[model samples]
Target: SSEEEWEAASEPDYDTNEDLLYPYSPTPYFGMYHLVKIPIGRGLLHHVDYWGEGKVTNLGKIRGFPQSYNVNEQFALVSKGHNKGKQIPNRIPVVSVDDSDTSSYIRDDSVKTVTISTGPITKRCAADVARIVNASEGLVVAYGYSDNSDDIQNLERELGKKGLYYGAGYELPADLRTQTEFSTKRVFADASSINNHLYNLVTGGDYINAVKTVRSLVDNQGSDVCRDVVSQLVSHGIKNAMSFAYKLWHEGHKDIVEDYFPSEFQLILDQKRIKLIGKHYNQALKLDANVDRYNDRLTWGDGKDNTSYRVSWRLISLWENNNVIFKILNTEHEMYLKLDVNVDSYGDRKTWGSNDSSEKRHTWYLYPVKVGDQQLFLIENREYRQGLKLDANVDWYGDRLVWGNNGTVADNPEYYGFIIQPWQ
Candidate 1:
């Protein structure tokens, strides 16, 4: 797509005029009101002729009274609702009643929507004006007011030539002067530096430093920096990027989290539910078989029978629209396993479950765990921190899947090592 097309697509869909300007919604008004253009001139401070040093005119004088007011178009006409009398000083100039049966300012045909043709614009006021323009749903033009026809044309040309200027760096020029350059935020030499920093911090379990790194990008560069870095990490196969994003959210970097991963953040905040959802596993389940003598050590006991279940069937997860559902299929058993929740013998909640759907236990929560150099999972129970575990000191087939204490079996390959496939 072209740059202009992309920009147009990126524009926010504002429901009302007020929302076009303000951040939060339940817009200030129900619909778009006319871009009420009143006469503005030199010496009119705060939309008023306080000093009375300049002449004030209206649409009535410039063109004619009671012009067309179209309801469908945005900010089509100027209205003040039932003008009481004619020409009150520093007040809206009243005009004859129109088809709407309401007194309003005469629509000026010569000038278009909300034109402010003058300025003693300071940096502060420029910022303010930029914000107003940024908030507007449609075009808003400003120029230096002048009676001279040549001067007016020159001002129009200048306005036309200029690009977007706003307080918070809206469409900022690449070399625009400011407190600092944008690229100055990059202290590292290459992508490896950022990757090493994030990977080291994440693997070392230093959430504080990880969060600080994310925070620094958002604080110094922009929200886009946080998003770019997170995206880069994800592209580099960083499994904990989502985890770190959630950690940043928990640490009050909610804006950064939302800006980077809006869908994930929404699932967390609005739904009050977090699914440790991501790429699916495709690689064959690598198992160490010490079948001669250590076989029993690797197997899980069913408490009484000492029966063991092997990793027979495995299916990659399908994460669609940030909604997680695992389809663990074992064609050999003619059975499909899913993530299911159930209460254990101790009356406490347990996370992972597999069945023939007889008792309706088929759902699971998959959490990411970095085990050594590999990415693993700790399928957690929804109601508690405890998760599905593989028995420790297991050899060959003795390693069994059973409920275990929280974080205790995180690093065990028997418990967590499973190759996951990425979302296609």
Candidate 2:
């Protein structure tokens, strides 16, 4: 049994202020809140700023994170969470958390309980995911507003990937010639394209393309580097703000942060000018027509038939996130609404219009609900975050589309909303 190649594997005695830099090569930096100790039922899910899980650590080397495959510290490194790829039993314990979504490892290494001799765990596992993201060419959230730690390890051999300019593309190099390298909507300082324009204003949900992706990332990284990349996404909170950061915290931020560029909903679906034969915010989405075709259902209309044909409906955009995956067709039974393969015990389900576009549950996730102007939609099931509503409100339209609330606008999209009408 012989295997080794993890070099100095340094745990740097715990907390060296913060090192997590990601890519400059040769383990650029790996240090951030690790407690790791979960046996039996999974307990010590510890501090986490990183956790990739390879499962097998006890100082024989291979603590947690990164994998190209080569360490046989008694073998068992099969990567990818909650062990569905199967082969777990080096004492089955994998727990990870940081930034979000969790990661892990371990096989009872006498559990390094606590010995904080003050250190530098320099953690940078660069994970935004899309299969190694062009082999770690992007995604890293660095720090330094106060406590020192920013030279990115002597500019990684004259800098590769332009030496990844830390978090929300945080400045450096002659203020990077005041940004604007041909607007792919500003990528100048790149923190996953400033979270791909903050997850497309968190999945395209109102207030002028979120002030035109915050004035085009402040006209290519200015306004103090997009306000420290929107101040670490407004201190990483509220599903990463996009209620236009909750109406700029109560009607402010000078008319929703603008410098210009918003000539109204800038198409991709024409923002909140939204579509589907208009007029009727509350009840209006009917299409019953005496059941049994693909086991039909799509009601709630009495808004005086907005140009009949079972209240038309249409939208396509398959996959993209911070929000988008719709398929919802029914422009007079062209059928495709699906999401009722049966799953009730409260995990909820119900929605029909099938003809099989190869059902990824017939796509639909829609999002957008800050209420008031009404484009309303929490319409779920891009793999069941459910929500389509009317499970019971005195059986309005005799209830039909149940799969209940998840785009959660504090449970008041004026009562679980859903109005996409623009099939003109």
Q: Pick the candidate with the highest lDDT.
A: 2
- Deviation in angstroms for 251 in model 1? 30
Candidate 2 lDDT score at position 17: 20
For residue 124, give model 2's deviation from the true position in Å.
37
Q: What is the per-residue lDDT of model 1 for residues 9-64, given as tens digits with 9 covering 90 to 100?
A: 32222221112122211111222346344223322112211011112224332211
Model 1 weakest lDDT span, ten residues long: 44-53
- Model 2 misplacement above 4 A: 1-216, 219-241, 247-251, 254-366, 369-376, 379-386, 390-417, 420-424
Give the TM-score comparing model 2 with the true structure, all chains together.
0.23
Whole-model lDDT values for every prediction: 0.33, 0.38
User: Backbone collision count in every prediction?
Assistant: 19, 25
lDDT, candidate 1, equals: 0.33
